[PDB]
Scaffold this motif. Structure first.
Motif, PDB file in Angstrom:
ATOM      1  N   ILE A 163       0.823  -1.209   0.000  1.00  0.00           N
ATOM      2  CA  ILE A 163       0.000   0.000   0.000  1.00  0.00           C
ATOM      3  C   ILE A 163       0.841   1.234   0.000  1.00  0.00           C
ATOM      4  O   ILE A 163       0.608   2.200   0.712  1.00  0.00           O
ATOM      5  N   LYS A 164       1.845   1.231  -0.897  1.00  0.00           N
ATOM      6  CA  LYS A 164       2.849   2.247  -0.825  1.00  0.00           C
ATOM      7  C   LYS A 164       2.278   3.668  -1.058  1.00  0.00           C
ATOM      8  O   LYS A 164       2.698   4.646  -0.462  1.00  0.00           O
ATOM      9  N   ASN A 226       4.326   6.524   0.892  1.00  0.00           N
ATOM     10  CA  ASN A 226       4.228   7.738   0.063  1.00  0.00           C
ATOM     11  C   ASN A 226       2.851   8.435   0.319  1.00  0.00           C
ATOM     12  O   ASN A 226       1.797   7.837   0.407  1.00  0.00           O
ATOM     13  N   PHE A 227       2.999   9.777   0.353  1.00  0.00           N
ATOM     14  CA  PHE A 227       1.794  10.611   0.329  1.00  0.00           C
ATOM     15  C   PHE A 227       1.131  10.635  -1.038  1.00  0.00           C
ATOM     16  O   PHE A 227      -0.053  10.836  -1.158  1.00  0.00           O
ATOM     17  N   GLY A 231       2.705   6.318  -9.394  1.00  0.00           N
ATOM     18  CA  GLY A 231       3.278   6.919 -10.440  1.00  0.00           C
ATOM     19  C   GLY A 231       3.309   8.381 -10.448  1.00  0.00           C
ATOM     20  O   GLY A 231       3.558   8.931 -11.439  1.00  0.00           O
ATOM     21  N   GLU A 232       3.183   9.034  -9.312  1.00  0.00           N
ATOM     22  CA  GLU A 232       3.335  10.489  -9.255  1.00  0.00           C
ATOM     23  C   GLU A 232       4.756  10.819  -8.599  1.00  0.00           C
ATOM     24  O   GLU A 232       5.346   9.941  -8.024  1.00  0.00           O
ATOM     25  N   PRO A 233       5.195  12.062  -8.514  1.00  0.00           N
ATOM     26  CA  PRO A 233       6.552  12.366  -7.946  1.00  0.00           C
ATOM     27  C   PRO A 233       6.578  11.928  -6.517  1.00  0.00           C
ATOM     28  O   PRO A 233       5.689  12.313  -5.772  1.00  0.00           O
TER      29      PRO A 233
END
Ligand SMILES: O=C(O)Cc1cccc([N+](=O)[O-])c1
Ligand SMILES: [Zn+2]
Length: 257
Positions: A163-164, A226-227, A231-233
């Motif tokens: 669930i990154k 990750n917030f 595939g986003e920055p």
């Protein structure tokens, strides 16, 4: 939308959620010398033997371990509370480094992380109705310090890779939250709020005195979340804590001498 950055973090929340500057906001600093022992407080009753976890969720602000709250299965009662409060989810707040991460502080000390077990008052029927009431929720807060591993946490840590990013969930059944509790149920209690938007002033806080220990390895895995979405920055999920807010006209009570 709101988050934990420079441009959207706690210091900005009041523009969309003016209750951010209200009279009963959370978290707070717990000044241990001024919290008065209240002999009228009861022992807390934490009854999680039938808790039924279902799923873990990255909501973009933390991860939530979710429970089936369709029956009285995992309930919090006693302590400062009147009536029965059903467990719906738990989540954590944590830091980029071990020196910060908690929401509540104790004599200005920040812990590495804080666990929040969220429960709703059954007299209001559902969570969404409960949050509209001043006695709608009871949140049990538990500090985390870095030292020995918490064996009971490891099941949670090992699912995080799946669930990154924001909006990912995964089946997460049969997880027993009793494994996250410290030995003592000594606590401080005060009236406050949700610590994320909408910041509703619906919570009886119960903050345990005794932290749990987790290992550096465990907390390091929280910090790999990750917030952002897939595939986003990449922006690491760290420092997802609201700082202490003004106590205003509140008393913090201690269950213990
Ligand atoms: O989704 C949200 O951020 C709002 C929310 C929901 C449930 C518990 C909360 N809390 O502060 O403990 C906050
Ligand atoms: Zn929280």
């Amino acid at each position: 939308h709101w988050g934990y950055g420079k441009h959207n973090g706690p210091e900005h929340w009041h523009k969309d959620f003016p209750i951010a500057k209200g009279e009963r906001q959370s978290p707070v600093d717990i000044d241990t010398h001024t919290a008065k022992y209240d002999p009228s407080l009861k022992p807390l009753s934490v009854s999680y033997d039938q808790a039924t976890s279902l799923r873990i969720l990255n909501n973009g602000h933390a991860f939530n371990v979710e429970f089936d709250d369709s029956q009285d299965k995992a309930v919090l009662k006693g302590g400062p509370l009147d009536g029965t409060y059903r467990l719906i989810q738990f989540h954590f707040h944590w830091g980029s480094l071990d020196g910060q991460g908690s929401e509540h502080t104790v004599d200005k000390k920040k812990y590495a992380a804080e666990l929040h077990l969220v429960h709703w008052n059954t007299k209001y029927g559902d969570f969404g109705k409960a949050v509209q009431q001043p006695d709608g929720l009871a949140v049990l807060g538990i500090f985390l310090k870095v030292g020995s591993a918490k064996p009971g946490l490891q099941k949670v840590v090992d699912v995080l890779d799946s669930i990154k990013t924001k909006g990912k969930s995964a089946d997460f059944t049969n997880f027993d939250p009793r494994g996250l509790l410290p030995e003592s149920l000594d606590y401080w209690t005060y009236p406050g709020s949700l610590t994320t938007p909408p910041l509703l002033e619906c919570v009886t806080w119960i903050v345990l005195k005794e932290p749990i220990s987790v290992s550096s390895e465990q907390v390091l895995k929280f910090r790999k979340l990750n917030f952002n979405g897939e595939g986003e920055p990449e922006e690491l999920m760290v420092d997802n804590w609201r700082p202490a807010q003004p106590l205003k006209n509140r008393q913090i009570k201690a269950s213990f001498k």
